[PDB]
Ligand binder design. Structure first.
Ligand SMILES: O=c1[nH]cnc2c1ncn2[C@@H]1O[C@H](COP(=O)(O)O)[C@@H](O)[C@H]1O
Ligand SMILES: [Cl-]
Length: 207
């Protein structure tokens, strides 16, 4: 029956070539209408699908279920291995969902853990998923707590991470130009990595 339901999701979703709202809405409905211990089993089974759109659905479920530390660890360490970039985009959204549910201030230790993780996809999920960082609670009132955390990744080894880092600072610069200017002025523009991030972050700054 659970297997039958995964088979129905595969039929429903496998031909979708763009977007994520259909998978998201189905996950939200299923999360709200069933007990969490059952939905955890469904999420793990769906995440094993060879249909990446069903894995997207499963990762939305993980986000809704992420108060359970075992689900959050599976997101951090296993979903981050997914070879499909659309699933990676859903991982970022599911991480934002975790932070929204617990509260952004209460989530800071987990944010910091993901930003320091060994898997570049874990680091990127946190940097990208919270964009625009200063539109979220806590960061909106404390913008330097976002700027400092993002700027710490300006030397990241991964280009995928660095693009998210630079664009996350670019977002913030449009509403907090004074604070981003102060941060950028302190950078020593030596490495290839930091120069890539600096160019993205500085477009709207009168340096
Ligand atoms: O790794 C990627 N490969 C291809 N497109 C990507 C990738 N990462 C982000 N995108 C882009 O993200 C966007 C997703 O929009 P969608 O196709 O309407 O769902 C597309 O422009 C994609 O080209
Ligand atoms: Cl936003």
């Amino acid at each position: 029956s659970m297997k039958q339901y995964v088979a129905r999701l595969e039929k429903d979703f496998s031909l979708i070539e763009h977007g994520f709202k259909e998978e998201e809405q189905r996950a939200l409905t299923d999360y709200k209408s069933n007990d969490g211990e059952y939905i955890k089993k469904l999420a793990f089974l769906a995440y094993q699908s060879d249909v990446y759109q069903v894995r997207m659905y499963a990762v939305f479920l993980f986000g809704y279920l992420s108060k359970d530390k075992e689900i959050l660890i599976f997101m951090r360490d296993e979903v981050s291995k997914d070879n499909n970039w659309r699933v990676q985009e859903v991982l970022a959204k599911a991480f934002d969902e975790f932070c929204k549910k617990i509260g952004y201030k209460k989530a800071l230790p987990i944010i910091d853990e993901w930003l320091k993780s060994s898997n570049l996809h874990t680091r990127r999920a946190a940097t990208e998923g919270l964009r625009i960082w200063t539109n979220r609670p806590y960061f909106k009132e404390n913008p330097n707590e976002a700027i400092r955390r993002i700027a710490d990744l300006k030397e990241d080894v991964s280009e995928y991470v660095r693009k998210s880092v630079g664009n996350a600072l670019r977002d913030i610069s449009k509403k907090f130009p004074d604070l981003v200017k102060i941060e950028l002025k302190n950078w020593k523009l030596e490495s290839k990595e930091i120069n890539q991030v600096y160019k993205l972050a500085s477009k709207f700054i009168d340096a």
